């Protein structure tokens, strides 16, 4: 407690809050999804509701410490509100995201942060075909709301969504789920615009 | 980084916040809509639900800086709460607007601000005739709640609602969508009142 208190005090209380990345101090965020459940399908409004864990990972030089100076602490957990977090957003949600987990992140002495919010998301999805053997495909893009790819780069560790936690008795079974980085360029501008496209093919079980 | 922390401190932690416009220091707010979806129609209540991005642009002299003095930073991103924002409100909503995006704005060195809240809106609209080829027309006015045209003037850069991101598998297709500045004069009130009328013609398909 004593050394951890000291560390947190040194990391958080001595300096201004990190102001976010810039083109001069860019950051890479790695995203991954663990899909738990397709809870709900609305064919009258074309909305589908998903429950997943979203793993976010990034690294800040300003969160680094030497473990020798802090009693060999290599990592700690702290309120997500004590640190800067990336503004990763679903671009086609239809309602505010519901948060299902505690907003606590893990910091490592090299300045690495891991934050894994559980979320329920409603997003734009025509389920026409869900009640067939072929099923139906939907997609939602995730990215920053204000940062180009010269400020925040996005990556996945794998294009396969984790389905090892998918609810076995869901009304919907998963035929495939991918999570893939896409890059856009606009004719005006050198900077790339990056997102991760969550693509889910599913059917009534 | 360092220079950005310095700039944010100079801009925000030295004077009181901008108190808002007055008749002697008026502001122009430029407003545009990117209509993403008509999510739902309710013929029992005459309520329609829209999902859009509302682009807001204005300029404060108190947000200006010389880039040469702050490491050639030309622009930055910051929490919406760090700055004054205009009280642009739908005049015929039936439910509190639901926010879908991070509340983060972009400030540029000439003091111009851009803020783009993604929103879900329920507003007053009789959808009778929505199942026909002729579709149906609804309208909702947007403006300041408390500031007249003497304090806040509204503008659009175009009368055409941006539909380039409208959801292609929506239950509802857009026949037209316009955003038109209006100037109203009331009997109580000597001062002019400005709104932007959003007029959407849509049908099932």
């Amino acid at each position: 407690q004593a050394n951890l208190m000291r560390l947190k005090s040194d990391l958080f209380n001595r300096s201004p809050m990190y102001p976010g990345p810039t083109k001069d101090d860019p950051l890479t965020v790695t995203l991954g999804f663990t899909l738990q459940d397709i809870v709900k399908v609305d064919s009258s409004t074309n909305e589908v509701d998903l429950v997943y864990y979203e793993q976010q990972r990034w690294k800040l030089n300003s969160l680094m410490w030497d473990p020798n100076e802090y009693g060999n602490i290599t990592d700690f957990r702290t309120s997500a509100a004590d640190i800067w977090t990336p503004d990763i957003t679903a671009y086609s949600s239809t309602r505010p995201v519901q948060v299902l987990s505690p907003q606590i992140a893990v910091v490592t002495h090299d300045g690495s942060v891991m934050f894994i919010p559980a979320q329920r998301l409603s997003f734009m999805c025509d389920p026409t075909g869900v009640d067939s053997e072929e099923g139906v495909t939907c997609a939602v893009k995730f990215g920053s709301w204000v940062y180009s790819g010269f400020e925040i780069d996005l990556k996945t560790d794998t294009d396969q969504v984790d389905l090892s936690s998918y609810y076995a008795s869901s009304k919907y079974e998963i035929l495939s789920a991918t999570q893939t980085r896409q890059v856009q360029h606009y004719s005006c501008c050198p900077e790339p615009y990056i997102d991760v496209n969550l693509v889910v093919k599913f059917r009534e079980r | 980084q360092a220079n950005l922390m310095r700039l944010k401190s100079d801009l925000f932690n030295r004077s009181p916040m901008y108190p808002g416009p007055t008749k002697d220091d008026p502001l122009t707010v430029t407003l545009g809509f990117t209509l993403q979806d008509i999510v739902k129609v309710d013929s029992s209540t005459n309520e329609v639900d829209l999902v859009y991005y509302e682009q807001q642009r204005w300029k404060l002299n108190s947000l200006m800086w010389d880039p040469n003095e702050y490491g050639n930073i030309t622009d930055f991103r910051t929490s919406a709460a760090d700055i004054w924002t205009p009280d642009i409100t739908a005049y015929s909503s039936t439910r509190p607007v639901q926010v879908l995006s991070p509340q983060i704005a972009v400030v540029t060195h000439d003091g111009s601000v851009m803020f783009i809240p993604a929103q879900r809106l329920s507003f007053m609209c009789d959808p009778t005739g929505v199942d026909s080829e002729e579709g149906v027309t609804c309208a909702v006015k947007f403006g300041s709640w408390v500031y007249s045209g003497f304090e806040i003037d509204l503008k659009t850069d175009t009368d055409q609602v941006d539909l380039s991101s409208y959801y292609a598998s929506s239950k509802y297709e857009i026949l037209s969508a316009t955003q038109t500045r209006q100037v109203q004069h009331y009997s109580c009130c000597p001062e002019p009142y400005i709104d932007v009328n959003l007029v959407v013609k849509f049908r099932e398909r």
């Binding site: 606009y186 004719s187 501008c189 615009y193 | 622009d75 851009m114 991101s165």
Partner: peptide
């Protein structure tokens, strides 16, 4: 394109 993208629209 850019002027419809919240990460880019501020350039318009």
């Amino acid at each position: 394109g850019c002027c419809s993208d919240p990460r880019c629209a501020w350039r318009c």
